[PDB]
Amino acid sequence: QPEPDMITIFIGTWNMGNAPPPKKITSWFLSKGQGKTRDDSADYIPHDIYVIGTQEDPLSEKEWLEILKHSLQEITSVTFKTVAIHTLWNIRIVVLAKPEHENRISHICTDNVKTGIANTLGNKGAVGVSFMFNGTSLGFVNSHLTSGSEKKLRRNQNYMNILRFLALGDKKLSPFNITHRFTHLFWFGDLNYRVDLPTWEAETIIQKIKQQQYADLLSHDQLLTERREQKVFLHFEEEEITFAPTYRFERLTRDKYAYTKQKATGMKYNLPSWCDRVLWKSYPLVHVVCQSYGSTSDIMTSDHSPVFATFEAGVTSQFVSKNGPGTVDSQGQIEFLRCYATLKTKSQTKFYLEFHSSCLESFVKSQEGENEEGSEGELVVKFGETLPKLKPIISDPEYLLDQHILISIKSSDSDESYGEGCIALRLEATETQLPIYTPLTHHGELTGHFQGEIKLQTSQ
């Protein structure tokens, strides 16, 4: 039985509005409704992994697991295995996988982050799951961010607290947050970003939605505009939105948006908005293709509609050679020429690099770089030809070209990372000097860049 080089992943997000679901929710898992929908000819084909995020979920874990597993069994005739389930208040994540994957999945991790302080600590935050699927690390985050049209900055703050403090994936990757720990990271939820148009334009917005004319609405979507200004979700992707706003509906129909201010809303308007979203970030030059992104039309218990997204995701096998794991493979090496970091810091300490990768027996510290001043004020840290030669555990190009090197630039004075990035070994050539580049981030904000050349030797 061959190991897969691709899997498909279902991501669902649904703010259930504290109400039990209706008796049939299969349209969600089938990616049917509005937007980019799944072909009918695939309806009996199970996805490999289903990841379900709920918010305002009134059900017990047991109650929701029974509904999810029975739904999938009805669709696919497969009894899925529960990989993980984690709940913070009424925010929940469930991971289900086909039984054939049970012995491909390991290192399962769950965590949560509570956002806000005093007043604002008590119902918002995130839950997440990570695991290995054969040689590939997968992370999943379900967040319920701060509500309200005039709180986009709070949402952005909630995002940074979540990516700083959610403790998923390999703890040995200590300089790295969740935005660097996984081959594929999916972040979804009721992100709560709104269409920022004047309240007086509510009926105009509704008209546009009825005409399926979303362009003048999406140009005011706060998540797209905050992302375009690099205020949130730097380096994450989102499929184009081609479905109507998923909030705020009258319950038991989808014929009406309920936008007007009410005591129950704190006297706030809820103009129709794309609150419910799926984004991803995958390492450079790994296969990831969104094959559906939409909302259901026939699940009406909540004031939100469920959102679905599906992905093809490249995966790798758990590689064993005669040499590594358990030793190095002398026919392999990774070399670095003409390398330098450009940092935005106003500080003057020495810096060194750390290289982390599951192709190395353990992480590698460089010598300190040489600081110079950039012609536009920057700190440039020069490594020239001084970086260590990295010794991979396996030299076989079918393994090594699929790997990635995480880079942290660290202060000599404090050993704190000032920037983190990732370099793919999926090169155009081996034994050839080739340009490399990554942006550097810290707490998910841009802090600099790392560029230079690489020379990769494999056994071929």
Residues found near ligand NUJ in the complex (CB under 6 A): 107, 109, 130, 132, 137, 169-170, 224, 227-228, 235-237, 358
Can you tell me the distance from the alpha carbon of 335 to that of 73, in angstroms, rounded to the nearest whole number?
Answer: 50
Instruction: Give the 3-state DSSP-derived string for 50-61, with helices as H, strands as E and coil as C.
Output: EEEEEECCCCCH
Between 161 and 358, name the residue whose CB sits nearer to ligand NUJ. 358
Minimum distance, C-beta of residue 380 to ligand NUJ, in the bound complex (Å): 24
Minimum distance, C-beta of residue 335 to ligand NUJ, in the bound complex (Å): 24
Between 232 and 341, name the residue whose CB sits nearer to ligand NUJ. 232
Between 130 and 403, name the residue whose CB sits nearer to ligand NUJ. 130
Can you tell me the distance from the alpha carbon of 179 to that of 281, in angstroms, rounded to the nearest whole number?
Answer: 7
Contact 48, 332 (CB under 8 A): no
Minimum distance, C-beta of residue 392 to ligand NUJ, in the bound complex (Å): 14
Between 107 and 287, name the residue whose CB sits nearer to ligand NUJ. 107
Between 37 and 403, name the residue whose CB sits nearer to ligand NUJ. 403
For 112-124, b/e burial (b = at least 16 CB within 10 A) is: bbbbbeeeeeebb
Between 145 and 224, name the residue whose CB sits nearer to ligand NUJ. 224
Minimum distance, C-beta of residue 95 to ligand NUJ, in the bound complex (Å): 13
Between 170 and 196, name the residue whose CB sits nearer to ligand NUJ. 170
Can you tell me the distance from the alpha carbon of 143 to that of 53, in angstroms, rounded to the nearest whole number?
Answer: 8
Nearest alpha-carbon partner for 364 in 342, 383, 344: 383
Strands lying side by side in the sheet with 379-384: 364-368, 351-356, 404-411, 417-424, 434-442, 445-457, 333-343, 379-384, 370-373
Minimum distance, C-beta of residue 280 to ligand NUJ, in the bound complex (Å): 10
Nearest alpha-carbon partner for 409 in 456, 452, 458: 452
Q: 71 — phi, psi (to 5°)?
A: -60, -55
Contact 27, 34 (CB under 8 A): no
